[PDB]
Design a binder for this molecule. Structure first.
Ligand code: FMN
Ligand code: FMN
Ligand code: CL
Ligand code: CL
Ligand code: CL
Ligand code: CL
Ligand code: CL
Ligand code: CL
Ligand code: MG
Lengths: 346, 343
């Protein structure tokens, strides 16, 4: 049985024509051995490749391509399974430099391909991570049926954000929120979590039930990086005032497409979403910057020092936990007052 | 001064090759007259068009193309301003049927164009409407600066949704939330509001300060349509149990594109967002399904019967409603009825 995959990628740095030639000859040699055929196109710093052959041979090759140093931001766009006919039966690997094609009748198609691909790469950034995952796996996200899944829900947001927005100019708030989002997204994604959306200054993400310790480590790493950042910058930098609170919950959530023709999105539905947001808010009243449910605790295997913060009610009460490592070295009320007083000019 | 634009669209059904030819014939005549050049391509049910010429000539033509019933789901991908040279100076409008091209050396580029565009159209379905607007207006959403704007913030969600999710099968929950979202989104959009996002079962939207009355009307209309729905369906249908609460607030919010190269989103930043969400939760404790701030009230000019609900801690703020938002039911009895109905 044969398959065919298509992917796009960003060429790492500036790549010479001779090293692009060094991809072609090795590809031709290996693909002839593996009975692989396909085409490699490049255009304005982007690679396009189509690979076809028996499934095991194609998957082995794509695993190696994925770790190749010469390109990055790799997104597989389409996978066709159990294909009847090869698309390029005579090309072990045909390389086409679309930049060098100056023919007048191909310029329209070449222009459209560059415009649509560059637009595609922008849109990719706005997708929930789950959608990018499904596309990478060759699954059309629009046709996926919703599933009840077990997830750890993550919410983190900015301490005293109302004071920051009240006292800072808009451009300074934007720099600060972008930095916060950049840090959260990088760390969540490094631990295998999936960012779902930004809501105001809040980052929403999920982890699997096998990722309880990764979820805690994510949260502590966020807190740790913010603490580092506050003493890295000057006192006139609003980043000097950036703190977070984090809530985690665990439960059954429905994951999938929701909405209508007018607006559709990837959503997560279930009690755990509300609980994680409420625990995120509760950290304001706690001497800890991370709060989570008993269910999150049961998903952890590491030797955390779990601390029981008692039962709290969520708009029936739920046990709230934290870890000793999440303890605040500051008093939260004193810090929100310091933030306001730091931003006071009078 | 000249501009160049590129858009993609979905060919409307039943569009034959003779009709596409007539499009080319008229385009050539009009574009020659207006000194417009470009190319029209089609492939597997999609149009691609590049248009270039003087700003006003191009804009007037594009406004016409926007209302042409021979295509739908039009997205202007890119606008180049102050172009120096035309890309197709000799083609008033060259029509290219990519479906008919069988040349072997073109097949790779044709295949990739179809793959990437179809994937692009999937991604578009998940994009924030505000980002799709910016792209259509030729604005780079990754570089355009967020702005401080005055907005009415709208928050609604489903009453006792925890009980619904606890007691219903997945496919039934999905049908129910989709219906709720479809109703909210259609009404908000009909009144000129902008749905921002879905957060769980919650709908977040915004209106301008000139849209105070429209925000109240939207809210009452959603409540009204849910009431209609509950007595349209049978008692075994979970939609029979669908109620909403709505909060509105007014304030300054930063609106824009935020994040990093790893993940972007469109967001509204400001205290008004939290206030609207807390007033939405407060309706559970109120004999009204709509609650809003003094600031919202000041944005209204219609002759509502405003009702003061006293100061509430969300310093406490004055909460208001309108007489029409009164609940004909007792909220705690409804939540107990939802629990009991699903037993
Ligand atoms: C864009 C791109 C496309 C590539 N395509 C192929 C290919 O089709 N076949 C292949 O064998 N190697 C291809 N490679 C290179 C592989 O990643 C790898 O360098 C090559 O298989 C040699 O691996 P080896 O020295 O460990 O055996 C490609 C690399 C890049 C950057
Ligand atoms: C995909 C598509 C592309 C079109 N491109 C052009 C064009 O480039 N120039 C043009 O005059 N009309 C174009 N039209 C048709 C116009 O929308 C309109 O039907 C035509 O200009 C006649 O308009 P009229 O009612 O003012 O006579 C296009 C229509 C479609 C569906
Ligand atoms: Cl290149
Ligand atoms: Cl800290
Ligand atoms: Cl610990
Ligand atoms: Cl509720
Ligand atoms: Cl009602
Ligand atoms: Cl009234
Ligand atoms: Mg905050």
């Amino acid at each position: 049985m044969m398959k065919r995959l298509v992917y796009i990628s960003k060429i790492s740095g500036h790549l010479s024509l001779e090293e692009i030639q060094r991809i072609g000859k090795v590809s031709i040699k290996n693909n002839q051995r593996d009975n692989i055929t396909g085409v490699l196109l490049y255009l304005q710093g982007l690679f396009f490749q189509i690979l076809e052959g028996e499934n095991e041979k194609v998957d082995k090759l794509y695993k190696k391509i994925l770790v190749d140093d010469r390109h990055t931001n790799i997104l597989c766009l389409k996978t066709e399974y159990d294909i009847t006919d090869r698309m390029f039966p005579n090309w072990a690997m045909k390389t086409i430099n679309l930049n060098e094609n100056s023919e007048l009748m191909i310029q329209p198609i070449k222009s459209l391909l560059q415009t649509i691909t560059q637009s595609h790469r922008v849109l990719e950034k706005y997708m929930p991570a789950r959608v990018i995952y499904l596309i990478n796996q060759g699954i059309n996200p629009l046709t996926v049926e919703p599933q009840l899944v077990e997830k750890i829900i993550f919410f983190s947001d900015i301490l005293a954000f109302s004071t920051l927005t009240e006292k800072l100019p808009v451009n300074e708030v934007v720099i600060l929120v972008n930095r916060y989002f950049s840090i959260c997204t990088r760390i969540i994604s490094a631990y295998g979590g999936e960012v779902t959306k930004f809501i105001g200054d809040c980052v929403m993400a999920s982890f699997t039930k096998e990722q309880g310790d990764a979820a805690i480590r994510t949260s502590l790493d966020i807190i740790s990086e913010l603490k580092q950042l506050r003493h890295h910058v000057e006192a006139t930098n609003p980043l000097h005032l950036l703190y977070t609170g984090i809530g985690l919950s665990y439960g059954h959530v429905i994951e999938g497409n929701m909405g209508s023709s007018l607006k559709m999105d990837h959503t997560l539905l279930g009690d755990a979403v509300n609980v994680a947001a409420r625990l995120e808010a509760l950290t304001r009243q706690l001497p800890y910057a991370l709060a989570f449910t008993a269910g999150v605790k049961k998903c952890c295997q590491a030797q955390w020092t779990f601390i029981n913060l008692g039962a709290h009610q969520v708009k029936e009460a739920i046990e709230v936990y934290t870890v000793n490592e999440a303890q605040k070295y500051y008093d939260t009320l004193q810090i929100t007052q310091l933030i306001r007083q730091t931003l006071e000019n009078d």
